[PDB]
Amino acid sequence: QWALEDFEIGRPLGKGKFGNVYLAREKQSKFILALKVLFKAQLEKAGVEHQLRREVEIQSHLRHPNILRLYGYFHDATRVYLILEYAPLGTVYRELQKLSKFDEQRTATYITELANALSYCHSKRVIHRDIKPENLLLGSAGELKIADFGWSVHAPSCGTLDYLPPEMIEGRMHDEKVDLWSLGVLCYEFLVGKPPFEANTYQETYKRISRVEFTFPDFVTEGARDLISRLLKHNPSQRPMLREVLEHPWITANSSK
Numbered sequence: 001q002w003a004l005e006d007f008e009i010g011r012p013l014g015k016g017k018f019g020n021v022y023l024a025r026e027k028q029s030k031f032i033l034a035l036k037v038l039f040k041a042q043l044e045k046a047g048v049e050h051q052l053r054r055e056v057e058i059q060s061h062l063r064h065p066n067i068l069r070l071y072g073y074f075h076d077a078t079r080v081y082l083i084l085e086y087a088p089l090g091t092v093y094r095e096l097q098k099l100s101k102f103d104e105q106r107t108a109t110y111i112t113e114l115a116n117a118l119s120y121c122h123s124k125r126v127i128h129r130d131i132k133p134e135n136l137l138l139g140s141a142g143e144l145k146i147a148d149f150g151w152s153v154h155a156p157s158c159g160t161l162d163y164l165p166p167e168m169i170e171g172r173m174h175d176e177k178v179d180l181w182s183l184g185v186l187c188y189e190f191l192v193g194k195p196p197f198e199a200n201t202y203q204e205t206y207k208r209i210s211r212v213e214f215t216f217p218d219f220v221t222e223g224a225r226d227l228i229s230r231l232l233k234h235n236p237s238q239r240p241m242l243r244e245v246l247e248h249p250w251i252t253a254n255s256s257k
């Protein structure tokens with residue numbers, strides 16, 4: 001079905017970890033795509049083979065304009081290859097380093113696209129549990145696309161803690177409401193330029209998250225402060241639904257259609 005000899009490899013798009021993502025073209029069709037090349041050696045050592053097979057399983061079945069498509073896969077003597085959709089405008093992470101922060105218009109648009117992709121995800125019981133600017137790509141029309149379903153499982157079932165909710169950092173039972181916390185973290189970071197629980201240590205970030213310790217800078221408007229505060233609740237049941245988020249007055253007044 002799939003072999004390396006079917007693709008013309010180009011420029012690197014990102015580096016790992018388990019390996020790199022390269023720009024590639026399918027010889028037979030001239031289809032431009034992105035080839036994630038993971039090394040079997042590193043994947044063992046970490047014991048992620050079950051998780052990756054789980055990711056690929058989930059990601060290949062999903063169909064949404066705000067979820068990055070996985071077209072297929074293959075493997076050789078030492079590497080596993082993922083055939084991904086190529087997002088031409090790069091990462092939201094890189095965009096945020098460039099602009100430092102985003103306006104209300106851009107933030108509400110990204111939050112709408114993210115909530116939509118998450119509603120679709122939850123309607124198939126899939127919980128992402130890893131939404132972060134490094135895992136968000138931008139399509140040719142600048143539309144947001146969720147990219148890494150590595151740490152995703154079926155609800156209700158590590159690096160920097162910045163986007164994880166209290167129930168997850170404490171090891172407790174967590175469900176769909178975990179992704180609603182991530183949304184609040186992202187909405188804050190888009191407007192401020194840094195996540196609300198950021199710190200110089202993991203130990204301190206853990207304290208900040210468990211205690212829900214965030215302050216808004218002066219430029220954060222009332223509407224943004226209301227949506228973020230509602231999302232950043234310790235009790236998961238106290239967080240709103242995705243329907244409520246899409247219908248928030250700050251979202252409806254700044255988003256797009």
Ligand SMILES: Nc1nc(Nc2ccc(S(N)(=O)=O)cc2)nn1C(=O)c1c(F)cccc1F
Pocket residue numbers: 013014015021022034036084085086087088089090091094134135136137147148
């Ligand atoms: N599948 C995919 N498409 C893109 N598009 C893209 C376009 C330009 C750039 S840039 N400005 O040169 O760094 C980067 C990516 N990335 N991508 C990935 O899997 C990917 C990812 F999710 C995270 C990090 C790196 C990646 F490579």
Ligand SMILES: O=C(O)c1cc(-c2cccc(Br)c2)nc2c(F)cccc12
Pocket residue numbers: 040041043044048049052053056073074075076080
């Ligand atoms: O035994 C292998 O060759 C092997 C295969 C895969 C793999 C195959 C299809 C889809 C996906 Br996702 C992964 N992964 C491996 C791995 F992660 C480590 C060692 C061997 C394999």
